[PDB]
């Protein structure tokens, strides 16, 4: 789901 991409992005850029 393309709509989930930014959430993963947000998570991996915190750490």
């Amino acid at each position, epitope marked *: *789901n*393309w*709509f*989930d*991409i*930014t*959430n993963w*992005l*947000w*998570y991996i*850029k915190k750490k």
Partner: antibody, heavy 126, light 109 residues
Framework: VQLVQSGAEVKRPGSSVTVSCKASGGSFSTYALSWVRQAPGRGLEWMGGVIPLLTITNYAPRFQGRITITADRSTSTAYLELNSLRPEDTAVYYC????????????????????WGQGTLVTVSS | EIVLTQSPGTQSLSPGERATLSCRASQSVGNNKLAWYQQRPGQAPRLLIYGASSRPSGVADRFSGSGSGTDFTLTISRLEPEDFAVYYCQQYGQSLSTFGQGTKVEVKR
């Protein structure tokens, strides 16, 4: 976050239109920007979107082959291009960016469209 | 392609009444990614509910969302004058996002 779109435009049948959407506030690069249109008196139709950092576009099958969505991170501007225009493409075109949770505008993205441009009326006519 | 059905397409109600608006999906909506928007004439739509039941801050708590799977509901506990408007559901649980055709809530007289 505010989205500001280019002004109304008259286009000839068969031409291509480009509509822009300048974001200010929050992060441009890591949030999903979509385009949604509404023909006069009709419903909202999602056309497609782009995640600029990744240059990953996602187009509705109905527009795949007629549409290009791009993002210029140097100006926080997103573009919709739509080709081979016909009377039925007469509509208000909105850009919209996903919302975020919590305080500020750098929170976790919610997918759904919290932030809308003012819309751009494109009239296809001779 | 997920078809969202908003039926009825119009509801005639009086100020102060309750409203419940239906959105039925042709297939299960992935992770309940179902949003609701309000649109008044001449205005851009405004997000009311996301993830079936989450409400942005800023949105009046008389709006609530419920449901999962294929069966979703927007509830307006008590209609204020400004709530008479068009409401659209939207699924974004697949890369192909779709909207319902909208339900207009209008004033019965």
């Amino acid at each position: 976050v505010q989205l500001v779109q280019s002004g109304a435009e008259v286009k000839r049948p068969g031409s291509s239109v480009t509509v822009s959407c300048k974001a200010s506030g929050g992060s441009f690069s890591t949030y999903a920007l979509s385009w949604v249109r509404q023909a006069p008196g009709r419903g909202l139709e999602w056309m497609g979107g782009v995640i600029p950092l990744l240059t990953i576009t996602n187009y509705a099958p109905r527009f795949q082959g007629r549409i290009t969505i791009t993002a210029d991170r140097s100006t926080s501007t997103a573009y919709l291009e739509l080709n081979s225009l016909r009377p039925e493409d007469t509509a208000v075109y909105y850009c919209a960016r996903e919302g975020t949770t919590g305080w500020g505008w750098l929170g976790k993205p919610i997918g759904a469209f919290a932030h809308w441009g003012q819309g751009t009326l494109v009239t296809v006519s001779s | 392609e997920i078809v969202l059905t908003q039926s009825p397409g119009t509801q005639s109600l009086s100020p102060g009444e309750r409203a419940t608006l239906s959105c039925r999906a042709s297939q299960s909506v992935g992770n309940n990614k179902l949003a609701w928007y309000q649109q008044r004439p001449g205005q851009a739509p405004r997000l009311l509910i996301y993830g079936a039941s989450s409400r942005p801050s800023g949105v009046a708590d008389r709006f609530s969302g419920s449901g999962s799977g294929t069966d979703f509901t927007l509830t307006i506990s008590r209609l204020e004058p400004e709530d008479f408007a068009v409401y659209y559901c939207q699924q974004y649980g697949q890369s192909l996002s779709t909207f319902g055709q909208g339900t207009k809530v209008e004033v019965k007289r």
